[PDB]
Write a protein that binds this DNA or RNA. Structure first.
Ligand SMILES: [Mg+2]
Ligand SMILES: [Mg+2]
Ligand SMILES: [Mg+2]
Ligand SMILES: [Mg+2]
Ligand SMILES: [Mg+2]
Ligand SMILES: [Mg+2]
Ligand SMILES: [Mg+2]
Ligand SMILES: [Mg+2]
Ligand SMILES: [Mg+2]
Ligand SMILES: [Mg+2]
Ligand SMILES: [Mg+2]
Ligand SMILES: [Mg+2]
Ligand SMILES: [Mg+2]
Ligand SMILES: [Mg+2]
Ligand SMILES: [Mg+2]
Ligand SMILES: [Mg+2]
Ligand SMILES: [Mg+2]
Ligand SMILES: [Mg+2]
Ligand SMILES: [Mg+2]
Ligand SMILES: [Mg+2]
Ligand SMILES: [Mg+2]
Ligand SMILES: [Mg+2]
Ligand SMILES: [Mg+2]
Ligand SMILES: [Mg+2]
Ligand SMILES: [Mg+2]
Ligand SMILES: [Mg+2]
Ligand SMILES: [Mg+2]
Ligand SMILES: [Mg+2]
Ligand SMILES: [Mg+2]
Ligand SMILES: [Zn+2]
Lengths: 50, 113, 81, 113, 58
RNA sequence: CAGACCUGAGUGUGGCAGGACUACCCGCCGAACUUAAGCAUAUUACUAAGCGGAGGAAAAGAAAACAACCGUGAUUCUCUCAGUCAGCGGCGAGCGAAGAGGGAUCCAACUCGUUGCCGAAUCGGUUCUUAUAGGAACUUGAGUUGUGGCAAUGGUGCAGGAAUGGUGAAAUUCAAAGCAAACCCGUUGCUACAUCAUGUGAGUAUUGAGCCAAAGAAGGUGUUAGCCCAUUGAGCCAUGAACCUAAGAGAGUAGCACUGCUUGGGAGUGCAGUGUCAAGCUGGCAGGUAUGUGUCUGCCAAAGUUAAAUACAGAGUAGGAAGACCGAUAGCGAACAAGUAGCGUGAGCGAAAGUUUGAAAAGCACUUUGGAAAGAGAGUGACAUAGACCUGAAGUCGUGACAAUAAUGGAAGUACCUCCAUUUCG
RNA sequence: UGGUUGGCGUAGCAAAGAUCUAACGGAACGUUGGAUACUGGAGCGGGGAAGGAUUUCGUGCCAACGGCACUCGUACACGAGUUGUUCGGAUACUGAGCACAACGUUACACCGUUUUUAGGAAAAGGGGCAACAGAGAACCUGGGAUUAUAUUCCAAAAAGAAAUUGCAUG
RNA sequence: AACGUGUCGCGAUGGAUGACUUGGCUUCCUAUUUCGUUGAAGAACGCAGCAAAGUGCGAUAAGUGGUAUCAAUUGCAGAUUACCGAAUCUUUGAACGCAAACGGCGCAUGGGAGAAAUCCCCGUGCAUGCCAUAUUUCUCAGUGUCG
């Protein structure tokens, strides 16, 4: 609903902008290991219960 | 950057605001390369500028009389223990008897043929 | 109806995030943390669970200052005048 | 000493360590001019590869790519599938400095070596 | 403007007055779902928001 | 009554405490599982968990110790004493030490109170000397309801060192597969495969010749490298502080009764509670069986500090050395963005994952079909049945060809096939 | 422990009545029109709490997922989006309650009372918290204002009209 | 015939194996080695030109400064590495001005902007307990003791 302490909004805000595909250019670095983001989250699956 | 230190207080402060005013404008441009180079020049001026104050409060509180009155951000932090520990000044103290009984029998050097 | 139909009966939260540990272990009704034991000053720590002592001990985080003071003890607290 | 330690100290070398650890032998004309044996590689010192497919191929050092332990040469390159030509890496111990790029610091490296 | 999230409205007025030299008849901020604060500052009619925004490199 | 003191507040001022860590260590707390072939005492165990606390160790320590000697001489530790002809114990299961002795460590000792002789000599603060000196002046401020002494350094200066770092050596990128069957002869002799079409990565390999070595010591480099690179030696080099040059002698104490725990400790090892409660004009405590008594021996408790030898049995910081260890279902849970994802209301639980293509990305441009994914060519590379991927098993499946007609199985033949062996030109 | 298997293209994917048509789109289910039903105001309606936390919106996408399919999606990617003197909350109520302090008890506070054998006023009974459904609570409409927010946005003829708090001003 | 069975050749699925190993485990050592109210450890939120995670850092934010070192970093773009003295170190947290699912609210002090003062931002102090002290000796309370 509407209610959120801003501290919770800052955290969902945190996880929200953290919920992004890895940059394309990061995969092109030497010795790179990363491909997909292993910490992609989906609201319908993992829950950030705050 | 040595030139950044020759500047006086306000000459720095005036030199600083023109960086922020120009760092901001790169941020405007960004929304639509020097921004790092600016951001670290602002950091240089705060470094030089925050140094003159600590270098001029160590100057205000120099001398034994005020050294106890010193702001403790300026007081020589060690570890909580190095500060609370007995100093050699009071550590090596020995009772007057001991002081005399160590003079009367000094650890005289010797060898045995 | 003790199964899936009573899972719908459960609506609240027992625990919100703690102000200290950041764990979702702050029992909102008994305003304390199940994890850190917060607001109690001394943090919760049991020897029957060292997997948890280990889990949240020093070095688990930034050791933000402790890195600075460790470097200093190693350098005899060498100092510029 | 031990292999994990020795072999880790290499693949986790600082760029500091990589420039020395990724040095090249001087060619005899220099190893006569200077009593130096091998000297760390740098941009713009001419070199000839002496091992691998590009054996015998002289060329200037376009870049010391220390993160890749290689040393791109102006002449040591190959066409990509798209036709863009790209430098091909080479390991400096495989080459021979034919003409090192002198200056004030580098001169001292020679004088103290 | 995205504006510092801890800043309040009166401070955003005083900041527009100083950064862009223009009065803000009002400044109703919101903090974005992302966590940035966002001010819609409306300029006084005496100040164009258009002449000023283009002066601003926009 | 003004004050004075005593008692107690309130602020100001200067400080500290609280948290973390807690492997080890100190104090308390305190199980049970287990064992006893049951089980209660016992055992597990004075352990785990629990609480509280330290430090780089801690605790212990300078005799109210042992012995019974030709006597030793703080503590800790260690080997042994000793799994004990000690001892405890349903005397069962079991438990179980100490003296001495060898050793480590150890130029290891001291301080109060008291007694006696003094009696503010003290302390704190202020100022001061380049100094919150172990200095000096000054202070009622504290302190005679007893500080302290007696007997029973600070300031400034130079250097060196050490220690860390900083630097720093040799020599091929030399030359181009074998046989001669101990070494010497011998630095010498002699020796294709799958008309067309491609195909052999890198030379640390082989050989031949040298070469360095106070360095052969392992790593890197496209193959196995003393000599391609890096490493270290000497020698130098720098540095912020630091580091090295007559009297007395402890009282709710010790003891004792009861209780309780505890211990090998046994008519009591230590302790605790409560009651009781000394002595110091044949003192007191120990002298491992109680009591009363007499000798003798060692000691002198009830206050304090104290390095080293020791612990680190799920710690840290900064480094280092290793291995008959594991080798990716192993080794830590974790070789990886691992205490991560994920899970649980929570306390908590908790993975899998080798980006090991290649020497290098040279990571398949371009053509072609396809809406695409993709496919067919082409290209790279030594190899792409090396294609984002070393190897590439089994099992399973697809396909081609082939033999064929409960399963498997054994024996023996025979039919057909055999990229198999051997033999024969026997 | 990993992988694989027969069963097996099987068992099923049968609760809530439903789609039809043309045109267009597309590489081939959507979109619009029409038709047809359904929900049937205790609604497959319109708003909220809890909860969720980007699901919102637009463009694109449809590899994977949406147990059939998708051209569509709550999926994927990219870019957007949430505006307040007056709404709610806090500032500022008390309540069942809770607990800091102190004090007490405990080998120990991580216990208890909740005032303290107690000098709690700093300019008679210490401090605090505890209700987004209780108490409190100054704002309304219109909009041609969005892709997405509005009792929040609108601009000088504020579309406008108010009320209200603080200070100050005649 | 078919299916099914079976052999063989290829191929797929699968991921064993072998080799590899910047990891673990164990042992040993060293030392000027042991956090915090001078704000610790932990937690949060942030900071890069493209940066989610991890790492680094803290509005001076993948760093400022000192030192050495050198010519790089390197996916692209654009013009470092190592160490350590000076700093910087956001919200918190023992957390301490009061609270707290509130990015809330104070009092005092100084600053700032600003403005017709009110508002608004900022810095510093402000928890409790205890010890010391009142050094120019603070103010007091008691039918405590006296005078
Ligand atoms: Mg669900
Ligand atoms: Mg929520
Ligand atoms: Mg139930
Ligand atoms: Mg219920
Ligand atoms: Mg708002
Ligand atoms: Mg503590
Ligand atoms: Mg039994
Ligand atoms: Mg324990
Ligand atoms: Mg001790
Ligand atoms: Mg002691
Ligand atoms: Mg002895
Ligand atoms: Mg026992
Ligand atoms: Mg005395
Ligand atoms: Mg007694
Ligand atoms: Mg016992
Ligand atoms: Mg005595
Ligand atoms: Mg493993
Ligand atoms: Mg393979
Ligand atoms: Mg069927
Ligand atoms: Mg109907
Ligand atoms: Mg949508
Ligand atoms: Mg999405
Ligand atoms: Mg009440
Ligand atoms: Mg309330
Ligand atoms: Mg209400
Ligand atoms: Mg309201
Ligand atoms: Mg809407
Ligand atoms: Mg990041
Ligand atoms: Mg607080
Ligand atoms: Zn918590």
């Amino acid at each position: 609903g509407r209610f959120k302490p801003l501290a919770i909004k800052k955290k969902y805000a945190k996880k929200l902008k953290q919920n992004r595909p890895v940059p394309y250019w990061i995969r092109l670095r030497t010795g790179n290991r990363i491909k997909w983001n292993e910490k992609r989250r989906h609201w319908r699956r993992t829950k950030l219960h705050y | 950057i040595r030139d950044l230190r020759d500047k006086s207080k306000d000459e720095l402060l005036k030199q600083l605001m023109e960086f922020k005013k120009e760092l901001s404008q790169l941020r405007v441009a960004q929304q639509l390369g020097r921004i790092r180079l600016i951001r670290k020049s602002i950091a240089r001026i705060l470094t030089v500028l925050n140094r003159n104050q600590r270098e001029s409060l160590r100057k205000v509180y120099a001398g034994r009389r005020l050294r106890l009155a010193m702001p403790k951000a300026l007081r020589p932090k060690l570890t909580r223990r190095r500060r609370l520990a007995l100093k050699d000044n009071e550590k090596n103290r020995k009772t007057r008897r001991q002081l005399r009984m160590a003079r009367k029998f000094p650890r005289r050097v010797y060898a045995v043929k | 109806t003790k199964g899936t139909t009573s899972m719908g009966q459960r609506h609240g939260r027992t625990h919100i995030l703690c102000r200290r540990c950041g764990r979702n272990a702050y029992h909102v009704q008994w305003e304390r943390c199940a994890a850190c034991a917060y607001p109690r000053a001394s943090r919760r720590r049991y020897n029957w669970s060292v997997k948890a002592i280990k889990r949240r001990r020093t070095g688990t985080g930034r050791m933000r200052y402790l890195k600075e003071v460790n470097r200093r003890i190693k350098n005899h607290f060498k100092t510029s005048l | 000493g031990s292999r994990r330690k020795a072999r880790r100290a290499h693949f986790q070398a600082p760029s500091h360590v990589r420039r020395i650890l990724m040095s090249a032998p001087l060619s005899k004309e220099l190893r006569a001019k200077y009593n130096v044996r091998a000297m760390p590689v740098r941009k713009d010192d001419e070199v000839r590869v002496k091992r691998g497919a590009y054996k015998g191929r002289e060329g200037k050092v376009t870049a010391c790519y220390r993160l890749r332990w290689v040393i791109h040469i102006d002449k040591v390159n190959r066409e990509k599938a798209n036709g863009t030509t790209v430098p091909v890496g080479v390991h400096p111990s495989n080459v021979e400095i034919t003409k090192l790029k002198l200056n004030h610091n580098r001169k001292a490296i020679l004088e103290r070596k | 403007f995205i504006v510092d999230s801890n800043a309040n409205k009166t401070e955003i007025k005083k900041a527009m007055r100083k950064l862009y030299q223009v009065k803000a008849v009002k400044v109703n901020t919101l903090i974005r779902p992302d966590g940035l604060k966002k001010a819609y500052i409306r300029l006084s009619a005496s100040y164009d928001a258009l002449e000023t925004a283009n002066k601003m490199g926009l």
